[model samples]
Target chain A: HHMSEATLLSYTKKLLASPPQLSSTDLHDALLVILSLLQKCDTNSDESLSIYTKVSSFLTALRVTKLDHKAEYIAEAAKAVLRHSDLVDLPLPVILDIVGTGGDGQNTFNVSTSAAIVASGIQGLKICKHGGKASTSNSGAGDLIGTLGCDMFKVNSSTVPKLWPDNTFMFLLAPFFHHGMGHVSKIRKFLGIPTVFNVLGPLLHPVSHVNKRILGVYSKELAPEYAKAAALVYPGSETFIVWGHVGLDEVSPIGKTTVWHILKTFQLEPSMFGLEEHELSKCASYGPKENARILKEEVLSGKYHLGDNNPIYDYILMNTAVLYCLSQGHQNWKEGIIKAEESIHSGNALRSLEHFIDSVSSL
Target chain B: HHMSEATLLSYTKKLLASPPQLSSTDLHDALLVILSLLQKCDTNSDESLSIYTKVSSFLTALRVTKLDHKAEYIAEAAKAVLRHSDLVDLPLPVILDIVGTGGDGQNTFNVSTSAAIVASGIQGLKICKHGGAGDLIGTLGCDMFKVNSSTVPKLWPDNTFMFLLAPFFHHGMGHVSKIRKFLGIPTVFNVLGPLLHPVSHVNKRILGVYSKELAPEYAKAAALVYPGSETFIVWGHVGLDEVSPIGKTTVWHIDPLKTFQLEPSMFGLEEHELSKCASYGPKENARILKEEVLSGKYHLGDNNPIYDYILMNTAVLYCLSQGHQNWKEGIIKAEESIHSGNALRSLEHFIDSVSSL
Candidate 1:
């Protein structure tokens, strides 16, 4: 699967000469070539960090003939990471991916992300969150974070790993860290369909070398494969692939939601979450404005309580709990959930958000 | 395979709600959805024309989110046609897809097309030509056809299908076509690739699609699935897929080039009629011009034929001959080894070109 020097030269010539415009076939071919290359690197015994850098450079130089191709490229890039390793070498104890698939069609608040900051304050889990602005939905994780004031900037190799245990949270906005994917942004914007790129928004952790990850896959079909891919990449890392059966990615509302836990010991099932089945009606319905209001209220109140009929809040809590478990090496998610709840109740989560906002402002 | 109204609505809603940007994944997903819908329609016993119309409408509404998505859209559109049988109303006879993958690297004369015109003159085969002009390779096929004095554009629901370049024909081409024409150095233009005729025409035809893929999957998909259609997907083993390679060609013709009734030797191969292959160096290769001059000199002076040395001219003749009995018989029918011997010679081929003209 590794491209021989000849094939690479030929592809490079094509890239340099024609510069790969966007088209369906072009996208397919590009995906094929990139996947092949990445697969080769993953399986190759002689693979090293340089292979990753080379692949990154190849991706950076890529100019998809269309926006669709660009999205495909990003998806492929994300998949490449999932196939290779969950953790990239960062100068930190651990990093985690906190992102969304974006096509959940829910203009909900940035609940998981908000919890990330709160959890960081309570539990001190060196959180390295990867996200982007609102391409769809009410407000994206990055959007909410930016609104809350975070110094999000383009993260180079040198800048990625250094901000470890300070506030215990590093927000790597997709635009800032994944500049190689920037080429197709305009094209993806034009071809307004939810591409693989949309799905990839969660998969690719800019600093992927960290040990743990929690990714939101929009489609149920993607969840298992993603979990498997993650397990294959990071044998030691704990990967939580969650899909909300109610169509939202966080967790289910109609019934018991599905969760694929790729842990060090075994792959856990949806039953692992042990939550009660509920309907979308059981969850509070709010438009973008209302969602934002609720988020702001939740942050300002500084007294968090698990509310009934608040599926969104529960979903957020569930995600944070999973992250907590992964970071702290908990045997069961129940212990992590309890700790996460305590963090929320003790106002530590809210304090972490305030601290993160203040830190960004001071910087 | 077939799309339900709900699925279509969902896809449309998603497409509309998002920025109308085209990415490979979006297009792929869209196509998958569209194909699924088509498959559904295909399985339904009540396969109606309304379904085809609906599919076309769905496709027509779909736009490339960005300029770069255009070529991919074209390719995808072409492949979509190949995949969906209902889209291409089966059993085509004498179908030739004269599509330009655009980025030919060399902006040579529209020789394959010119050859198509000449072939049409000879046999009157139904030609479904797709063209675009002057973006990367000189003038695109559509523009060139438009500007040509001999060419005439007639809009018809059936018969001759003319996809007037990517710019005019494709909705996606509107934004980038101009930029491509202005900037003009064969960027992705070479890869815009072959055009797919929504309505299948002709059975046996020649396609000058892109040459990157090891096999012409789309073309082969069309050829094998569509009953009676025999296609030759040629990637000028030498330069691009448009022209024939000098000596050897990577040809995927269902039937053999030589038959017992007709052979390559029948075209006076024993005599000095055959010429050496031409070079496809770059866009500026003077082979076409040189051939033109040789033809003129052969006609002007009472001397030996000069243009016989050009490989492309011979290749065109060879292609026409293959359309007939065998390669040999076709070649013999194309040209006689007369050196200004027959007075009726002028009248014969002149009438042939005249009738088609």
Candidate 2:
């Protein structure tokens, strides 16, 4: 049995008031308690969703404060709920995280977010994209989406499901989702170097109860572990963890893009995708603002039957095809790709995007 | 040559005012500067010891404050001076450090301090005992000696040297140390637990450096990698790092203890010298006080002393004797056992103690 909400909140307040400099073990114990609370929040018969929402808000505050061990606490809390929560009945959607590890030193455009938009625009896949403001690069996924007038802030359970039905996407800003992690951002900014938090950001998905996920890894070494962890944790989910061979995280611009594909049975493999790798220069190159312009032009124009010069457009279409195939219960990803290309050619994907934009605009 | 005192003091203040939470690599760089300063302090040049004392005092304050990577910074500083400082001359005294890695729950007695006093008292070996007292223990080596009636602080620099005492070992008191180690104290404390000097010229040592996790490992594994370190690291099975076979230690006791014989050159190992390792019981163990008194007694005692009964005296005698002997000379030790009558007269041992007192 866990403490009641009032009791837990009281203790949390006490700890925050003093903010004792924790030893490793104290930190570990606190994390365990938070995990326990999260598990209880997930299963409580009396307003469990409300409990989760409140806890989520509390954690978001902790993250904003940049308190020590805040992320570990959040991750453990999330893991506990995912492992023990009776909220298993919640519908699993097609999820994609468009966040960065942030240490790439490459200020590339928000390729993953653009890809998500284009994919939803074309193939009509329900997308939940996760992201935050760029720390290293000039622009992040949230920045790009907000620029394109995709409402980035209207993210809640009710709002999320509505967006899903309309073939629209929700940018689950990490700070808003894992608010507990926000507390450490200032310290991290002052530290001015990548710490474990940087790597952990992408690994933690707030609304992670999805059947399929696409994650972009920052490094080649991380690809295998990320894939293995995803496969281990969500055995039934189809997860494609990829790292572009070039510095770009969305898809490879140079040679072969390394991908770890997790099947429904939880098997992981490096799957080959895309046309033979072309040099990064072959893809459209522009500054962040220009890149946003290019992305909008590619998707909007691609919707109007104008062919796109940006290779990134095709990359988005390819990933969207995979998401559609996974969601529609197609066993083969290649078949999904064929259908996705046809959907685009027949302008069905464009119609879906236009319909979503118009619907959200009217709302 | 090392950096100047003003520069070192400025650096120390800078670090304290805005203590950088350093990674392992960053710690390594900072240590280089500190060790260089320590090397300069040791040099008998135009530089005065007063300058070094001021700088060392500043460092002591920094350590007490629990600045991040304090031990790591100090350890690396010692290593840097040992490896790079040209001021370090040859024929340096055998430097033995009496330090803890800070997670031992025993809180029993300052066994290492007593052992160093006894070893120095009996052998006249120069002792450089390093320790602190803030946490669960009593006053640290520097502070306790400075405050206590038994120890005169000035005598330390000349006879037995005392380095900067850790904050946990000094002002933090035993309660603070216990609180710091409230969780997983035994394991983490055991690892990275010993304080081997950062500046390495003081070479000969008997260290009680052990962790249960890495118990089988020789402390010398780290020491050998150091530029000028020759150390004897011991961990008793009974949790004490001294010569207690009565309990359980990880048993990687190195240097002469493992290699040398007790009898021949150092005289025979008296059975009276061995005893059951004492328990902490309900009260403070007299180990530290007893060791300090014994050190004073060893110097004061006359020649032709009779063998004693208290058993501790005999043990001290045997330990001293063994230090003198070669492990290979078994026949000499056996012969001494019979000839001294010191080995056979257990009854008179108590008499010798009374007379000494």
Candidate 3:
């Protein structure tokens, strides 16, 4: 934690010059160095793809070495930096966040971002939507949100104090909050592989405090630890980390979504929500513009109708329903779909998006 | 074949920077580049060792990646460079050479150098001893490059035991000694040291390999590089990196027609442990060399490992030199010559000749 920039770069130079075998401790320190630089990634996710790919390479080697157990020490290192960052005093609206390790490569629409906006429509919940432009797939949350005409950079924590009173979503763009990713971006892009930061960005919401969070991970093996990282940083906050079989970061009504409810983890099937299950392909989209179009005209507007099986509706409904349930303190998701279904049918979800747009444009 | 200095360095730089799991062609190319530069390790085994270790690291990765089978391709590459250097015409004696990959860390005195001197004492024989210095004082004393090179051919006659220190024979070896020193490990080049002799056309030679596994490969390599030569690759069972009179030595005898193995019992020597014959340094080794093998005395220890070690190896060379039917007779012939003090004459002759040079 006391590592300086000079000491960090000294380690960085060694890592760039060594192979993983010769540089195990250097890589360990360099990773911690990456973590030190990246705890500030609350401001941006795009800067350190090298940090991401290096994390990817190490884990890739771990699978070869069959030492996932060692990853615990790495998690502890990341947690210590996050713990240090969390100890910093900040203004708190204690917003709810929906983010994920989205590099599932599915190019699926930004369902989690839309779900955050939809869930924010419910009473007593404010969303500090933390996301970035695309990394693993065609569109990230910030991409789809940007397509919807909001300047993510213009909206941040300072904007939060004033916008919190309106109870509409205020986008906490990752680039604005995490000013530290600048030093690491190049090598990440050159190596061009998924990394630890790819897994971390979602768990680290920009705000010092969060009331509730839904973290979706690209890999299911990461859920339990992603849930752990979230717990250490947010501590007492309500959190659910979701991993869908369809391989998107958002909850999939396709097969089943593996979920961790900060306390215990479980799975949720579409049948449990009175919706017919379908394959993941049913929810796939072209790219960000199409995803934004669907979010505005179809999912949020409740205009798309399905006589029997509609994964788009069920996928969004299932994700937003969890947030809605968490917001209203509804422990049992059995009846949780009731309020979300009501919110959409009564045009309140669309009303919430319009209000959020109005508040952001005015700001 | 058309490699420029810039082209070679760029290839070398890229290889040093590449991941161990680099494409097979790159590793293959890096190795050829090493072999290409090393067509000249007649200079520094250190530079050769550096190239050897980097190749070893990548080849170690190949063992993981199951690409070690490509060493054959590399063996062929070394063959080409060997052939290139061989084609450069020099007046040839067709003399016998004795050498080994010396970094066995045994620091066991130079048995091969002594044995070469002993074998050279036999009539109608000559010794083109190719080796490096950092190994130990015995080999370092046998260093031919200790004197100036332009005077070597004039001062040292072919019929006498001639020490051809590696550097004088191969000029290209200068570039890679830095790489070997950087890596600090035994590499393919370290393995190839004895084999990549500048006296490439020597028809008969005794080689001491560091390990038993390498005996057959070097046997094959010698057959590939110098087809008509009678090449013997020897390995000490006690890890001496030379014939250890204490332990059973395995020998791969490669001739023009075929290859075979020869053992210590063939030379009337008992298999024992090498600790008995171990030399502490060059002073002790030199004392043993001049006192025991050259002067035909038994001063080292209870087992007579050093004497028998020198006798057995010298027997292999004598058998090759005299065209004997079997090594047992050669051992008898070598033992008699030492008792007659002929090897002492050869050693003293070698010392005088190099000094005058």
Candidate 4:
């Protein structure tokens, strides 16, 4: 579980020797040492950056040929976060988190956050969306949520359950739960490329009872590994890991999206959910203010007229329907879409958004 | 040219990214930056050791597949030494250095050091041996010359034999001395030390390597650094660095790129056991060279293996110096150099000159 300083230095030398490959235990132990240093060293110091960046560069090379071990690295890192962070109980039996690894560089619409809010409109369903500000894209889930007039609630074990249970929609701002991540966050942003930490975000949400997940990966080949990782870390939990052929990280309304449900794999298209297929170019992303306007005035507002070329609406609808069915534990895709539309038309999703904003603001 | 601290940091990051291979220019530039930091930073600080050890590990892995580029690495490092070290005048026309990359862990006879002193006894052949003490070269070079830090640079080049201590010549090496001791690995500097003699007028060399795999690379680097040169790159079958007196030795001629094998019997000498050549350390080894071998009075019944070992290696260098093809005449000349007491006299004359200086 822990390594001495001498043993840590020896492992670092061994890693730079560039073996054929390291096993899961090797990566786990290596990450444990790195995490220990992250917690100990001054953030972004020259020595820390020198050591961490080289290790990150080596990992970037390892990312090309080794896949399964990367999932194990993710699982180990997720377990470390769980152990280090303050645990908060949501009190809900089944909580769903709809988020993507989000560094797809697609700069597409913030579909995952909008879908989480829309799905929270389902009766008795609890949606706790965990995220940070935009790293690669223009608008991250937290960025859009903040733009929508919601103050992110800092994590406290006692205050979370009281504020979260009053409404189904709650945003668990990631930094508040994981305070030790700022050091690594600075390094990840400095590296610029998609490192292991890019894919590690969705797995690091601190709620132990948030058992159901709709996880989106940046590449089709990595989705199945994410499925295995989800099961390894959250035992017996249900997760639908997904990727789109066009490099979107969420359920694509433009083209085919690959879905991984444990050992079972399948394909999904917009037509399967009775939504119109739209061009990905039409879903070009905006900054936080404009994206929030689109979510508030165009998608969630019941009075807005649905047009033929509404990619944002259709895109959010497709991802929302998937979460709806995962939360409902049924395979009725068309019925899920109908329920998602009702959440929009009956203004329940908008009310859920306002209720979450008011709940956190009043705190 | 030196790199700024900002630029040096960028190159380190680029190096760790591990490209397919860096160009000669890229490697040269990177080395220049690293040399700048090495000279500036504390020698064995935690920061210095961390950065240098990782870079050393990277280069060790690069050594396997990238042979030619490593030659360039050696060439650039040698150039850095030549630029930084204090200059000295050796008025002799043909100067030779006989040395090896000595991390072979053989603990065998100090064959190269003894051979250099013995080869210096030849007529009008100037051998300016440059080495550091590994407990072998240090004691022998210093004991043979009575050299200390103050008297090291003042040795007369016209003498038949001269020993230049490495640190007195290559002062920048002080920065890496402690780090190398900490690592105890074969870095580029391990091979770089042999190429970094103070004077640049060395026209002939008998370079020896521990591994034959590095023979060609070192050969190519010898050509690059010592252009228009006559040199032999040697590796012994017994894993010795010098011309082995017992078994076969693989020799690569650098000028035209040729390789062949030589053994004791080829030189009309009996094969001696390698154990007979072992000395406890430098002081013991120096005593044997000064008493038994250089005194040159050993009988056949004594079965003195170190005497034959010195004779064979010294004869090879004698032949290379005089441009002789037959090994018999060279062997006869080497035996006479020892028996006539001229080798001991040459060692004494160098010591006397150091005392006067």
Whose DockQ is greatest here?
4
Q: How far is candidate 1 from the true structure (C-alpha RMSD, Å)?
A: 13.1
**Which candidate number would show the highest lDDT if scored against the true structure?**
4
Model 2, A59-141: lDDT tens per residue? 32233233422434434433533332222124633454444455666665566776565455434356666677777777777
- Candidate 4, CAPRI quality class derived from DockQ: incorrect
Model number 4 iRMSD = 8.3
For model 3, residues A1-363, the per-residue Cα lDDT tens digits are 444334443442332222424233444465555556555534213233223323323332332222222335335434533433322235533368888777677866577887787776666667777777876676677788788877666676577566666655666666665544433453344323333445556644656556888888777766776677667657788888888876767778677888889758788777777778766677776688888888888777778643335667777777877887777666566466776666677787778777767787886
Best-fitting candidate, scored by TM-score: 4
Clashes of 4: 1
Model 2: residue A197 alpha-carbon error in angstroms: 5.5
lDDT of 4 by residue, A109-188 (tens): 88889999988887767788887788867778888888899777543556687776577888877777765466466545
Question: lDDT per model, in order?
Answer: 0.46, 0.43, 0.60, 0.71
lDDT (10s digit) by residue, model 4, range B49-83: 34453343334333322432367667876776566
Rank by lDDT (best first): 4, 3, 1, 2
Chain B TM-score of candidate number 3: 0.74
Going through the candidates in order, what is chain B's TM-score? 0.47, 0.44, 0.74, 0.87
Per-residue lDDT of model 3, residues B1-357, tens digit only: 543233343443333332433443454455556556445543433343333323323332333232332335335545433433322234543479877866566756567777887787777777767776334423434445553346555645544676655655544445445444433323344555565666544679877777666567667766765678887777777765676666466677776634455566766677656566666676667666776566766522334777777777777787777665487787776777687788778767766666665
TM-score of chain A of each: 0.67, 0.64, 0.78, 0.90
